[PDB]
Amino acid sequence: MHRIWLMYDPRRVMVALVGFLAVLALVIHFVLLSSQRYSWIENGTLGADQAPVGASAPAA
Amino acid sequence: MHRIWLMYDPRRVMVALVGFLAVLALVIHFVLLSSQRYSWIENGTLGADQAPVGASAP
Amino acid sequence: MHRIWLMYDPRRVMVALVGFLAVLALVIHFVLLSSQRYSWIENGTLGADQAPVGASAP
Amino acid sequence: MHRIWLMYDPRRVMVALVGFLAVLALVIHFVLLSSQRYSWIENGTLGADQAPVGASAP
Amino acid sequence: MHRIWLMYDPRRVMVALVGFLAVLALVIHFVLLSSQRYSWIENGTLGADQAPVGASAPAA
Amino acid sequence: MHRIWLMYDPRRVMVALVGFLAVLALVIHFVLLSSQRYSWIENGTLGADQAPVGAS
Amino acid sequence: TRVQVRTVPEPGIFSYLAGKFGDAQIGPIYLGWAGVLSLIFGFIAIEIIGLN
Amino acid sequence: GMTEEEARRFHGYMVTGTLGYVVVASVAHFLAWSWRPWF
Amino acid sequence: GMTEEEARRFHGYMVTGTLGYVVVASVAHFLAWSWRPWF
Amino acid sequence: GMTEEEARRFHGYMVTGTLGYVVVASVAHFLAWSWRPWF
Amino acid sequence: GMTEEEARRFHGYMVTGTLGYVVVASVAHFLAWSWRPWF
Amino acid sequence: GMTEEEARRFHGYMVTGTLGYVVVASVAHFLAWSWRPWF
Amino acid sequence: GMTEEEARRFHGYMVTGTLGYVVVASVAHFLAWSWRPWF
Amino acid sequence: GMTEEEARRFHGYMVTGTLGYVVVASVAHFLAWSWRPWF
Amino acid sequence: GMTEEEARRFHGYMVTGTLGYVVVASVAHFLAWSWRPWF
Amino acid sequence: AMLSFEKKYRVRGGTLIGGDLFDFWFGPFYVGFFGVTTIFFVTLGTLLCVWGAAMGPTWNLWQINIAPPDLKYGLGLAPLREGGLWQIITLCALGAFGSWALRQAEIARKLGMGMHIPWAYGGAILAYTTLVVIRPFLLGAWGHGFPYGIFSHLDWVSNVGYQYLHFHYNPAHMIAVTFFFTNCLALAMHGSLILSVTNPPKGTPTGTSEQENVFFRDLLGYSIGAIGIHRLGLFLAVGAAVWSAICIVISGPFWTQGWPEWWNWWLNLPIWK
Amino acid sequence: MHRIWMGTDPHIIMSALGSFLVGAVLVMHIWAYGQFNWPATLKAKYATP
Amino acid sequence: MMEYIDGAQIALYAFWLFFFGLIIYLRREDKREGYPLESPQGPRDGWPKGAPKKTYVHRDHG
Amino acid sequence: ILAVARMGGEREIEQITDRGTAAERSMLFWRWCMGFNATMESIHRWAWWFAVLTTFTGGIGILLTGTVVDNWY
Amino acid sequence: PTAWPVDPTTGQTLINGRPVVGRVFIMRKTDGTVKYPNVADVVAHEALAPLPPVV
Amino acid sequence: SDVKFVPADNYNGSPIIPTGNPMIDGVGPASWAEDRRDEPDLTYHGSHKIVPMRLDPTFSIAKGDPDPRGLPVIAADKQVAGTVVELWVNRSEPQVSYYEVQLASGERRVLLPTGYVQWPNFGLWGNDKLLVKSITAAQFANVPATKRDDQITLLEEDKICAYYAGGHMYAFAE
Numbered sequence A, E: 001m002h003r004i005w006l007m008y009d010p011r012r013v014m015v016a017l018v019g020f021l022a023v024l025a026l027v028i029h030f031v032l033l034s035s036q037r038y039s040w041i042e043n044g045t046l047g048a049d050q051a052p053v054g055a056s057a058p059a060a
Numbered sequence B, C, D: 001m002h003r004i005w006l007m008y009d010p011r012r013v014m015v016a017l018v019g020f021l022a023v024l025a026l027v028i029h030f031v032l033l034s035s036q037r038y039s040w041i042e043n044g045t046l047g048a049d050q051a052p053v054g055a056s057a058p
Numbered sequence F: 001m002h003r004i005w006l007m008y009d010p011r012r013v014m015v016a017l018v019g020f021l022a023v024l025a026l027v028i029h030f031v032l033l034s035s036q037r038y039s040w041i042e043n044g045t046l047g048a049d050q051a052p053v054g055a056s
Numbered sequence G: 001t002r003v004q005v006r007t008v009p010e011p012g013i014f015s016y017l018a019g020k021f022g023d024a025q026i027g028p029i030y031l032g033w034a035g036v037l038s039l040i041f042g043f044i045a046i047e048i049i050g051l052n
Numbered sequence H, I, J, K, L, M, N, O: 001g002m003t004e005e006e007a008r009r010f011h012g013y014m015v016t017g018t019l020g021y022v023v024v025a026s027v028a029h030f031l032a033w034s035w036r037p038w039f
Numbered sequence P: 001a002m003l004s005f006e007k008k009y010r011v012r013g014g015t016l017i018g019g020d021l022f023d024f025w026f027g028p029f030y031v032g033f034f035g036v037t038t039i040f041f042v043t044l045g046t047l048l049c050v051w052g053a054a055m056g057p058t059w060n061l062w063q064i065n066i067a068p069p070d071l072k073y074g075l076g077l078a079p080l081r082e083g084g085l086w087q088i089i090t091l092c093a094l095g096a097f098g099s100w101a102l103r104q105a106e107i108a109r110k111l112g113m114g115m116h117i118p119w120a121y122g123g124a125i126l127a128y129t130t131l132v133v134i135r136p137f138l139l140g141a142w143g144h145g146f147p148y149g150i151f152s153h154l155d156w157v158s159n160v161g162y163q164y165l166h167f168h169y170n171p172a173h174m175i176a177v178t179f180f181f182t183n184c185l186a187l188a189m190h191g192s193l194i195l196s197v198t199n200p201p202k203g204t205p206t207g208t209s210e211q212e213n214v215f216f217r218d219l220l221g222y223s224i225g226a227i228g229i230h231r232l233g234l235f236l237a238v239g240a241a242v243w244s245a246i247c248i249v250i251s252g253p254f255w256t257q258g259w260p261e262w263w264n265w266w267l268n269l270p271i272w273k
Numbered sequence Q: 001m002h003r004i005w006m007g008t009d010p011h012i013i014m015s016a017l018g019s020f021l022v023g024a025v026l027v028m029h030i031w032a033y034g035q036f037n038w039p040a041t042l043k044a045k046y047a048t049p
Numbered sequence R: 001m002m003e004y005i006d007g008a009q010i011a012l013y014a015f016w017l018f019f020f021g022l023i024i025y026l027r028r029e030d031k032r033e034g035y036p037l038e039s040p041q042g043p044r045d046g047w048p049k050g051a052p053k054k055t056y057v058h059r060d061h062g
Numbered sequence S: 001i002l003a004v005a006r007m008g009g010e011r012e013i014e015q016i017t018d019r020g021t022a023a024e025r026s027m028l029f030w031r032w033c034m035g036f037n038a039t040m041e042s043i044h045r046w047a048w049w050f051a052v053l054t055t056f057t058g059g060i061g062i063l064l065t066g067t068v069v070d071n072w073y
Numbered sequence T: 001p002t003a004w005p006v007d008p009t010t011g012q013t014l015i016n017g018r019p020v021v022g023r024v025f026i027m028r029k030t031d032g033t034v035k036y037p038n039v040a041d042v043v044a045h046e047a048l049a050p051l052p053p054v055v
Numbered sequence U: 001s002d003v004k005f006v007p008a009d010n011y012n013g014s015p016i017i018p019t020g021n022p023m024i025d026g027v028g029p030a031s032w033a034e035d036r037r038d039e040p041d042l043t044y045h046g047s048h049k050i051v052p053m054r055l056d057p058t059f060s061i062a063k064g065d066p067d068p069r070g071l072p073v074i075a076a077d078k079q080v081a082g083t084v085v086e087l088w089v090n091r092s093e094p095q096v097s098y099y100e101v102q103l104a105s106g107e108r109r110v111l112l113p114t115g116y117v118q119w120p121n122f123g124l125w126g127n128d129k130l131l132v133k134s135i136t137a138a139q140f141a142n143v144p145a146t147k148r149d150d151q152i153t154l155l156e157e158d159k160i161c162a163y164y165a166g167g168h169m170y171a172f173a174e
């Protein structure tokens, strides 16, 4: 599998990888920070049973 | 793992690192500053139990 | 540690640093001057117990 | 310390310094003049016991 | 002290100085003419006991 | 004091001076003309005791 | 201005070259398969709008 | 470019570093899960 | 430019011009003051 | 560019600065934690 | 350019012109203060 | 650039200029403090 | 560019000025804290 | 970098400092235990 | 940098200055303890 | 500091007013007589803006608002706090913008360039002068100018549009918008063609005028030529500002109804009335 | 054991260890003050009512 | 949850970081000609430091 | 470019590959006017990005509307 | 409380018990404008939210 | 002197002053890119891009327009400088880049870039002479020469264009 570094310059791929991971990490954190369940800056000290839960089926 | 400094110019990478840390720290400080719980300039003298907390499940 | 000045021209670094510190100082002062607790031009003569504090938990 | 004038041309530093101090002085005067306590053109003849003070904590 | 005129061309320091003073003088006059206490064109004939004085609202 | 004309070619200074004075004179007149006390086109015939004063 | 040249044989080596720049045909305004389908699909869109 | 000998050397670091990152992310998920499970 | 002698000659008119202008303005101000004082 | 001898010397300072920075940050976090815990 | 002698000659006019202007402004402030003090 | 003698000569004026300016500012602040203190 | 002798000389000034600035900022924070603590 | 004989000499002081530190800390803990025991 | 000769001189003064500091601090703490003891 | 080829070009001459007296540089900037007047007007106008901010309710950059006077003041200079300050800043702005165009003419003359850049910038000055001088004068009050404030002038644009109920129906506005949108397409097209011949895919020869001519002809169905695309860009960008000036000066001075009912002439052509 | 130090700069070693000890000591004191109720008992002893 | 933070504010600061990154990139490209600058105090690069001079190869007709 | 067309400035690809006096005068005009300049190539990058960012930032503004913000005022 | 007390003997305004020479006015920023605190304050000055639609 | 110019004075932003004739030395608006490659510009197929029109019979005047060849050229001081002998055409984007003028006084032929020429009524009527507003008829004698007379290098293009570009500032200078 090491032959793929002949196919792509690692000096390019390392920058692209770090950029991809940095974006993905920021996206996931801000998606969670925008949620109610995981808005940890305001509600992080709530216990798991105290944490919000999205609405369930009314079984109507 | 030091051969990263042959793979990349350390003068350039070290400036990139400084820029990354600068922006990241400013992002985290301003996010905290505009929260309610950690708006430390207005409310930093409140005790931990007096500080705001988000609403629980009903 | 002094070999950092072979990587970067100290004349350039000092200009960059002086510009950085000037901007950073102005930002921090304007943040404080915008706040309620540290609006020191209007309220600086208040004693520390009289100065504003942001809202607590209920 | 005059060493510094071999790293930087005096003509350039004095232009930089005059510009910085002119702007800084104008910033501070207009900030004060925009305040209540130090709007000295309207209220400069009030005594220190008569000048405005910002609201305390309740 | 006079060696300043070897560093800078006096013909253009003097232009910059005259321009600076002209700007500053006009700014101060327009600031005062914007004020109430020193609106001298409309109220310059008021004696100092009648001149406006700005105060804060009474903190009742 | 005449040596100022060796630094500054007087043929130019006269034209700049005349221009500056012309604009300055116009600005002062328009400031006065639309004040209440000195709107002389409308109220110039009022005596000094009848002229407005900007009391607060 | 007003001394225009006019070129009888083909410029690009008034008139225009019929030829190739490698894979690229020169001469007609290029459509290819994607251009032809684009005009067909787009024409039907324009017709539906106008008829409505 | 680079030789197959350099490529093998780089690949060995790259695999090890990737696996190191996934291991640390595994611990972060273990800690997040025990704080506040998402299922 | 002009000689120093020309500068001394020109400067004489510039003074009398300025003085005449200041004189006319001084009369203009005292007329305005007499009509409607600003202090 | 760098020699590989310089690269190893440079890496020693870079690691030691990184360690110092992590030390300061971790003290800062434990100060922040003691004042107002986020979990 | 100019010699030190020319610089020193110009500097004398410049210094005296500045101080003369500051004196005229000092008297203007004395008049303004007598009419309507700002402190 | 300068000779180092000219650097020394310039530096002495720069120190006195900075000092005199700081003195004027210090008196200006103490006048302001006496009239309307900000702490 | 610099010799390593010049670099070592500048480093002495650079470190001293940095720590001098941090010391003055420490006194500023001591005064600010004594006037109005932020925790 | 540091040679074997430099390292051999360095290690002797390094162990001595570490033991000296642990001795001082042991006295500190004995005093702390005699003041406010924690088990 | 320092020679081993300079280092051997410098060390003796550093050790002595540190001892003077710790001695004076020890007097300070003995006085403070006699004034307001903290255990 | 100077570009590595610059010193050769820094000759005297080409000034309009000041002769050799101001014919010098300050860093990169050329000065000249209109440099001096520029900085005067820029400094005065900016400090009066900062004064308008200081006497206003906030220092928040977005919220600062130096407003014109009430319409009751007509074409007089109002009290400075009541909007006379806006009028002084407007004179400073006109002085600065005019000085900037004349300074550009001195720079072009010194370099042996045509006057195209000063005249192109004149299209922007025309639009500004229409908004704050010509249209307010035709309406009879300086109070019709727009306020100086980053968002408060957008409130003015909003309310002026709805003064005519549905400003999209303004026929000169439709043309001006079409110029703005066509300009942006043309800029994307020209920018892309130059870059793609000068930066071909890796391992490919640098392209040629003939290639961009071939591709452009496939895009539009005609070849514009190298000078023609720059004429087109200048025509579109400046024509946008000129039609903008027209569209606002007809709104109020010449038309006062809703813009939709302007189109009544088209519905009443005698071939189909 | 001393072979571990070969190739290192001793000033780097002392900077690394110096950093760690300062950090650990500060953390331990910040923690210990919360647990042991000191200096809170000290402050209460000298506080004015 | 976070009151003051919202997705439009997050998106806007993401754009600002991209945009300043782009201005830096463009200013590097702007310096491929005419740099380093001449000055009385020696050569000057300004900031950001320019990208290098660029060599073009032309299609071989030989 | 029209101001330097007399000097062959409209032959932009030649001016990019083999800088003429028309390019040099273009750079000096803007440097002397506003204190900084592009190059004959990079001005086309400024052009490209300003056009592209018009519709790109526009599209983000539309996607945010009614999904994240319902009242922009 | 919209004006300070007046000394009936001299007619001078008294601020914090001590006279002011001059005619006192209450300072305000341009046209009495005040910065909007937040959305909740802006909405507190409006009508209530519209009723649900009739469908 | 080998230096083409000296500073007006010792202050930082001061202009330079040419030592010799600035049109010939290449100073100020008369200057050219002196580092420019001394080779011809080429078409996509590698032929010389700019050539005299006799060298490519593919090119002809548009049938409505006057052929300028034979017409007199009138310099800025209103003298006849010469007559147009030949046109040079751009083979990549077909246009006339240069007129070629046989000088009336003397014997040399010199190139004259279009866009410095103009027709008396901008082409509308009366197209019987050409105007060269930028340089005097004596200055035509020193217009830079191409090292061949069927081909022009990029450096030669710059030198020729720069000579006419300097004219508005320097043609009447003492």
Ligand SMILES: CCCCCCCCCCCCCC(=O)OC[C@H](COP(=O)(O)OCC(O)COP(=O)(O)OC[C@@H](COC(=O)CCCCCCCCCCCCC)OC(=O)CCCCCCCCCCCCC)OC(=O)CCCCCCCCCCCCC
Pocket (backbone or CB within 6 Å): P001, P002, P026, P027, P028, R020, R021, R023, R024, R027, R037, R044, R045, R046, R047, R048, S034, S035, S036
């Ligand atoms: C930076 C780290 C962080 C990074 C992240 C955030 C910022 C990202 C952007 C970074 C850009 C580079 C900044 C920089 O340092 O530039 C140095 C360089 C000067 O030229 P140089 O070639 O590089 O250097 C030569 C010089 O060093 C030596 O020569 P000399 O000694 O003769 O030069 C005198 C010097 C003195 O240096 C300075 O004064 C620097 C001044 C920088 C001012 C920046 C102000 C920004 C805030 C304004 C707030 C507003 C105040 C009113 O050089 C000069 O004389 C300066 C010439 C440039 C004049 C610029 C005029 C204004 C430009 C537009 C301002 C923004 C308008 C929205 O100046 C420039 O190139 C500035 C102009 C380039 C950017 C224009 C971008 C316009 C975008 C408009 C679209 C906005 C859409 C929303």
Ligand code: BCL
Pocket (backbone or CB within 6 Å): N017, N021, O014, O015, O018, Q011, Q012, Q014, Q015, Q016, Q017, Q018, Q019, Q021, Q022
């Ligand atoms: C060139 C000198 C060496 C070094 C050599 C020593 C020596 C030798 C000693 C210490 C000691 C200490 N060092 Mg040190 N140390 C270095 C760099 C550091 C750095 C750093 C930011 O790089 C840090 C955080 C530390 C941290 C520390 C502490 C753990 C400790 C004492 C407090 C203190 O910090 O005082 C200093 C504060 C600073 C910011 C560092 C500046 C350098 C000073 C001069 C080092 C202190 C010397 C000390 C007064 C000598 C006393 C000798 C007695 C016989 C004990 N060192 C440098 C690279 N360090 C002492 C120790 O182990 O105590 C447990 C000790 O005896």
Ligand code: BCL
Pocket (backbone or CB within 6 Å): M020, M023, M024, M027, O021, O022, O024, O025, O026, O028, O029, O032
């Ligand atoms: C409740 C606490 C106790 C007490 C308990 C102790 C104990 C216990 C000890 C000390 C120690 C010291 N105490 Mg104590 N101390 C008290 C009250 C005081 C008062 C006072 C009330 O005026 C003073 C002046 C001091 C002074 C001192 C020092 C003599 C000494 C530390 C020396 C040192 O290195 O300082 C270094 C610090 C400085 C030089 C900073 C000074 C900053 C000044 C005030 C502001 C400068 C501003 C200026 C702009 C800076 C410019 C910088 C340049 C431009 C670069 N104490 C009270 C009564 N103090 C210690 C000692 O003896 O050590 C040997 C010690 O162990």
Ligand code: BCL
Pocket (backbone or CB within 6 Å): G049, P157, P181, P184, S054, S055, S057, S058, S059, S061, S062
């Ligand atoms: C009362 C009206 C509202 C308003 C409502 C809107 C709305 C709604 C939108 C804009 C949008 C835009 N507005 Mg707005 N706008 C107002 C006020 C203004 C003012 C002003 C001076 O007041 C200005 C200058 C602008 C300017 C702009 C642009 C920056 C932006 C469009 C960019 C673009 O290129 O679009 C033109 C480009 C395109 C539409 C892309 C088209 C590309 C496709 C591929 C072309 C296909 C052609 C097809 C094949 C041809 C055949 C078609 C068939 C005939 C059918 N608005 C006020 C506040 N504005 C847009 C935006 O981005 O918002 C954030 C948008 O959606």
Ligand SMILES: CC[C@H]1c2cc3[nH]c4c(c3C)C(=O)[C@H](C(=O)OC)c4c3nc(cc4[nH]c(cc(n2)[C@@H]1C)c(C(C)=O)c4C)[C@@H](C)[C@@H]3CCC(=O)OC/C=C(\C)CCC[C@H](C)CCC[C@H](C)CCCC(C)C
Pocket (backbone or CB within 6 Å): G036, G038, G039, G040, G041, G042, G043, G046, P181, P182, P184, P185, P188, P189, P219, P220, S051, S052, S054, S055
């Ligand atoms: C960077 C942002 C700007 C932008 C850029 C831009 N637009 C572009 C491009 C670029 C870079 C192109 O390359 C592309 C283009 O081709 O340009 C010429 C395009 C384009 N921008 C367009 C329009 C456009 N751009 C706009 C805006 C913008 N374009 C932005 C301002 C707008 C606005 C403001 O509203 C419009 C309307 C098009 C002209 C073109 C894309 C053309 C296209 O997609 O066409 C699809 C096909 C049809 C519509 C069908 C046509 C049908 C025929 C009329 C029928 C005739 C009969 C037919 C022969 C029958 C079939 C028989 C078959 C056998 C053939």
Ligand SMILES: COC(C)(C)C/C=C/C(C)=C/C=C/C(C=O)=C/C=C/C(C)=C/C=C/C=C(C)/C=C/C=C(\C)CC/C=C(C)/C=C/C=C(\C)C(=O)O
Pocket (backbone or CB within 6 Å): E025, E026, E029, E030, F021, F027, F028, F031, I006, I009, I010, I013, I014, I016, I017, I018, I021
């Ligand atoms: C709203 O209120 C606001 C506005 C805000 C309040 C504030 C206002 C402010 C700040 C005002 C500032 C005012 C000011 C400050 O300086 C004003 C300064 C004014 C001045 C200097 C006026 C000078 C006038 C001089 C004149 C007219 C000279 C005429 C000369 C003549 C006729 C002779 C010419 C020579 C000849 C004929 C000889 C040729 C011979 C030759 C050649 C030979 O012989 O060779």
Ligand SMILES: COC(C)(C)C/C=C/C(C)=C/C=C/C(C=O)=C/C=C/C(C)=C/C=C/C=C(C)/C=C/C=C(\C)CC/C=C(C)/C=C/C=C(\C)C(=O)O
Pocket (backbone or CB within 6 Å): D025, D026, D029, D030, E017, E021, E024, E027, E028, E031, F001, F003, F004, F007, K006, K009, K010, K013, K014, K016, K017, K018, K019, K021
């Ligand atoms: C709203 O409130 C806000 C505004 C906010 C509050 C804040 C305000 C602030 C911050 C103000 C700051 C002010 C300031 C700061 O420094 C002000 C500084 C002012 C200064 C320095 C003024 C200097 C004036 C100098 C003059 C007039 C000189 C004249 C010289 C003359 C006439 C001689 C010319 C030479 C000759 C004739 C010789 C030729 C001979 C030659 C050649 C020969 O012989 O060779």
Ligand SMILES: COC(C)(C)C/C=C/C(C)=C/C=C/C(C=O)=C/C=C/C(C)=C/C=C/C=C(C)/C=C/C=C(\C)CC/C=C(C)/C=C/C=C(\C)C(=O)O
Pocket (backbone or CB within 6 Å): B025, B026, B029, B030, B033, C017, C021, C024, C027, C028, C031, D001, D003, D004, D007, M009, M010, M013, M014, M016, M017, M018, M019, M021
């Ligand atoms: C929302 O949150 C918000 C509110 C924003 C809050 C959060 C804020 C945040 C995240 C802040 C971060 C701050 C920070 C991060 O690192 C800050 C970092 C600061 C730093 C590093 C400061 C360094 C200063 C150094 C100085 C001053 C050096 C001076 C040097 C001098 C004087 C000597 C010069 C040389 C001379 C004299 C001679 C040379 C010899 C020569 C020439 C020879 O010999 O030739």
Ligand SMILES: COC(C)(C)C/C=C/C(C)=C/C=C/C(C=O)=C/C=C/C(C)=C/C=C/C=C(C)/C=C/C=C(\C)CC/C=C(C)/C=C/C=C(\C)C(=O)O
Pocket (backbone or CB within 6 Å): O006, O009, O010, O013, O014, O016, O017, O018, O021, Q025, Q026, Q029, Q030
């Ligand atoms: C409240 O809650 C919390 C905060 C948590 C509580 C906890 C607090 C804690 C943990 C505190 C820890 C403190 C500490 C730990 O180490 C403190 C350490 C203090 C130390 C080490 C002080 C050392 C002082 C040394 C001095 C003054 C030396 C002076 C020497 C001089 C002047 C001579 C210089 C050299 C010469 C002359 C030779 C030149 C010759 C040359 C050049 C030649 O010969 O060539």
Ligand SMILES: CCCCCCCCCCCCO[C@@H]1O[C@H](CO)[C@@H](O[C@H]2O[C@H](CO)[C@@H](O)[C@H](O)[C@H]2O)[C@H](O)[C@H]1O
Pocket (backbone or CB within 6 Å): H008, H009, H010, H011, H012, H013, H016, H017, H020, H021, H023, H024
């Ligand atoms: C937070 C810490 C704990 C979890 C994370 C752990 C991160 C991973 C640490 C791995 C460290 C050792 O990792 C190991 O390093 C050696 C060199 O030292 C690498 O070896 C590398 O160089 C050698 C020769 O020198 C080659 O033969 C090899 O192919 C190449 O990859 C190995 O490929 C890697 O597996």
Ligand SMILES: CCCCCCCCCCCCO[C@@H]1O[C@H](CO)[C@@H](O[C@H]2O[C@H](CO)[C@@H](O)[C@H](O)[C@H]2O)[C@H](O)[C@H]1O
Pocket (backbone or CB within 6 Å): F001, K008, K009, K011, K012, K013, K014, K016, K017, K018, K020
């Ligand atoms: C134009 C300057 C400002 C004048 C403003 C009017 C009010 C001030 C009083 C001016 C009185 C005369 O002021 C004095 O003039 C003389 C020449 O006469 C100047 O003298 C200057 O030039 C002379 C030669 O001409 C030199 O020898 C001398 O070293 C130099 O100082 C002085 O520097 C100035 O102090």
Ligand SMILES: CCCCCCCCCCCCO[C@@H]1O[C@H](CO)[C@@H](O[C@H]2O[C@H](CO)[C@@H](O)[C@H](O)[C@H]2O)[C@H](O)[C@H]1O
Pocket (backbone or CB within 6 Å): E001, E002, L013, L016, L017, L018, L020, L021, L024
């Ligand atoms: C807006 C407020 C600004 C306040 C600024 C205060 C600056 C105070 C002066 C210090 C700075 C200028 O520097 C000071 O210049 C004066 C000018 O007379 C010099 O004065 C002296 O030296 C010069 C030169 O030999 C002589 O020509 C002069 O007659 C003599 O008095 C001082 O030696 C110098 O120290």
